[PDB]
């Protein structure tokens, strides 16, 4: 979806091919271990955060 | 209870950290009751009791392996028996393939339990062989274990009383001539740190 929408530009392509987090649950965990440090990341809490 | 002057620990730089050769984060953790530190270590008894402790540790190693193989043999006994008696008499053998995978996961359940135990023993031993003074140790579990099994020979605690203890057991001359030797014949950034 992203590449299909943000493909007219090249900076979005670059960012696309360097995230290495494909997955909504693992992206939720990604920002969970960012906004709430020390706490154990549970997909349910990241979904609610 | 003793306390610490704020001027000599939360400064730029930290004079207490420069005197004791400790990072400011380590000092903050030790002072405010968040980590342990090893004040002293009786190395003579951790020199002459070494191989004896290693032999007891190998005894527990072998006993855990013996337990594992014992109940793995008895689980494979139960398996073999029940599986050959009830190899999907009525239904399809996909159920006995599901319980084939389930029996493989039972062998790997007892195998990962023995691996976990092996790791506990390994780390306990490693820590008890690499215990020098002024070494920060976190994880209450490990500490408590080390203080239960190998209680003596190792002393340490947390709080300002353990920094008073570190300061009392401090030798100015030895560190001073060590720093002067490093600055005299040295380069890189260790010379800058010594300066």
């Amino acid at each position: 979806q992203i590449v299909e929408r943000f493909g007219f530009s090249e900076i979005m392509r670059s960012t696309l091919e360097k995230d290495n987090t494909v997955g909504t649950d693992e992206a939720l965990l990604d920002i969970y271990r960012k906004l709430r440090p020390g706490e154990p990341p549970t997909k349910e809490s990241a979904q609610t955060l | 209870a003793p306390v610490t002057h704020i001027w000599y620990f939360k400064g730029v730089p930290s004079r207490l950290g420069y005197l004791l050769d400790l990072a400011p984060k380590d000092l903050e953790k030790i002072i405010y009751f968040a980590a342990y530190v090893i004040t002293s270590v009786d190395e003579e008894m951790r020199h002459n009791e070494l191989s004896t402790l290693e032999a007891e540790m190998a005894v527990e190693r072998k006993a855990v392996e013996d337990q594992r193989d014992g109940e793995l043999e008895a689980r494979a006994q139960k398996l073999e028996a029940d599986l050959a008696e009830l190899e999907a008499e009525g239904a399809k053998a996909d159920a006995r393939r599901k319980v084939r995978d389930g029996g493989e996961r039972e062998m790997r359940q007892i195998r990962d339990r023995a691996q976990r135990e092996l790791d506990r023993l390994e780390d306990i031993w490693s820590t008890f062989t690499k215990l020098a003074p002024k070494q920060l140790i976190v994880d209450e579990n490990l500490y408590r274990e080390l203080v239960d099994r190998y209680g003596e020979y190792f002393t340490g605690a947390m709080g300002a009383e353990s920094i008073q203890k570190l300061i009392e057991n401090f030798d100015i001359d030895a560190e001073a001539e060590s720093l002067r030797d490093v600055i005299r014949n040295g380069k890189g950034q260790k010379k800058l740190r010594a300066l």
Binding site: - | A1, V3, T4, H5, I6, W7, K10, I31, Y32, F33, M158, G159, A160
Partner: protein, 48 residues
């Protein structure tokens, strides 16, 4: 700030001379340390 230090010191003394578990004594020691630190320099560490 003096009243805070005295209160924490008195509570710590009474709790020490009672046979309290280590966790509670450690908590009280941390709180006394923070109170003294705030007495000597308020705002240097943490919040004022």
């Amino acid at each position: 700030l003096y009243r805070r230090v005295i209160n924490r010191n008195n509570r710590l003394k009474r709790l020490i001379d009672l046979g309290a578990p280590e966790i509670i004594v450690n908590n009280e020691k941390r709180m006394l340390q923070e109170s003294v630190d705030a007495l000597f320099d308020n705002g240097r560490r943490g919040r004022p």
